[PDB]
Amino acid sequence: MDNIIMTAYISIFVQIITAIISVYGLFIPLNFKDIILREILILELIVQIIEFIFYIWLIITLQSINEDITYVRYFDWVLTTPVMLLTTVYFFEYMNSDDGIRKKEINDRDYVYLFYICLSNFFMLLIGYLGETKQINKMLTLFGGSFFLFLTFYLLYVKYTKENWMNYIVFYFMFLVWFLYGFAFMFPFSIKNQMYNILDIVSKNIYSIFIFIVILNQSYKLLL
Ligand SMILES: CCCCCC/C=C\CCCCCCCC(=O)OC[C@@H](O)CO
Ligand SMILES: *C/C=C(C)/C=C/C=C(C)/C=C/C1=C(C)CCCC1(C)C
Numbered sequence: 001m002d003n004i005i006m007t008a009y010i011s012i013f014v015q016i017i018t019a020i021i022s023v024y025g026l027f028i029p030l031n032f033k034d035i036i037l038r039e040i041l042i043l044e045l046i047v048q049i050i051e052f053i054f055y056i057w058l059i060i061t062l063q064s065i066n067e068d069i070t071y072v073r074y075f076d077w078v079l080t081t082p083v084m085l086l087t088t089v090y091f092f093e094y095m096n097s098d099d100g101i102r103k104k105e106i107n108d109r110d111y112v113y114l115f116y117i118c119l120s121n122f123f124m125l126l127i128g129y130l131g132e133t134k135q136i137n138k139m140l141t142l143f144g145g146s147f148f149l150f151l152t153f154y155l156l157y158v159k160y161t162k163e164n165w166m167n168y169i170v171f172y173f174m175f176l177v178w179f180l181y182g183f184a185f186m187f188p189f190s191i192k193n194q195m196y197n198i199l200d201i202v203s204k205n206i207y208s209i210f211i212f213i214v215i216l217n218q219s220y221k222l223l224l
């Protein structure tokens, strides 16, 4: 109990600092080509609002814990993970498009394909929820959930990446981190939840800090 709590406190700490940074980021002036970065950052802040609600719920609920509350995380992830996938698409498009591009152009052109990505991701989460609540066995959950995780990342890769190291870094770092949520599913209650608490720092908050630094680097002459 103490270690789930302490890791949640660490995760909260990084959330609060990150959110402050992200807010200032929204007001940094941007050149035409960089506007999509602010579009990304406001979606990451929305993700933060949801995440924070779950973590306050968690630390309160952990005071008197009798039930395995792990499943409640899925009510967060079903809202946050599609947003994160959209923002990943937008960042790849930003990195890889020669001309400036904004989210409206991407959404209007690709909404069907984006729905397929989010649908695959939804099936991954549904299978995990069934496993986490013990409606299917662990082995089926890991093979079915991993199948959909792969499919989601394959769809991402083949439409949105280019073959270069700045793509490989963004793509594989994320793919590995998301795969580690499946790895955590294997473990007993306390270890599993400690691993989700820290993984959320990496999968959400580090991404926001990354975007902030990209913004500050692109725009620092407009600031100074
Ligand atoms: C235009 C600049 C592009 C430079 C890209 C490579 C440069 C530096 C490395 C940045 C630090 C790691 C990448 C953060 C973005 C990312 O993958 O986070 C996913 C993470 O949340 C886990 O899911
Ligand atoms: C901010 C929260 C995030 C990014 C949560 C992500 C969760 C996953 C990628 C879950 C993955 C799973 C597997 C890979 C297999 C089946 C079990 C899951 C759902 C835990």
Ligand SMILES: CCCCCCCCCCCCCCCCCCCC
Pocket (backbone or CB within 6 Å): 003, 006, 007, 010, 194, 198, 201, 202
């Ligand atoms: C002993 C049980 C409780 C442990 C609490 C601390 C556990 C987590 C330690 C690391 C937390 C920060 C993780 C940062 C990201 C990991 C590496 C990212 C590379 C880019």
Ligand code: NA
Pocket (backbone or CB within 6 Å): 068, 069, 070, 071, 132, 133, 134
């Ligand atoms: Na459970």
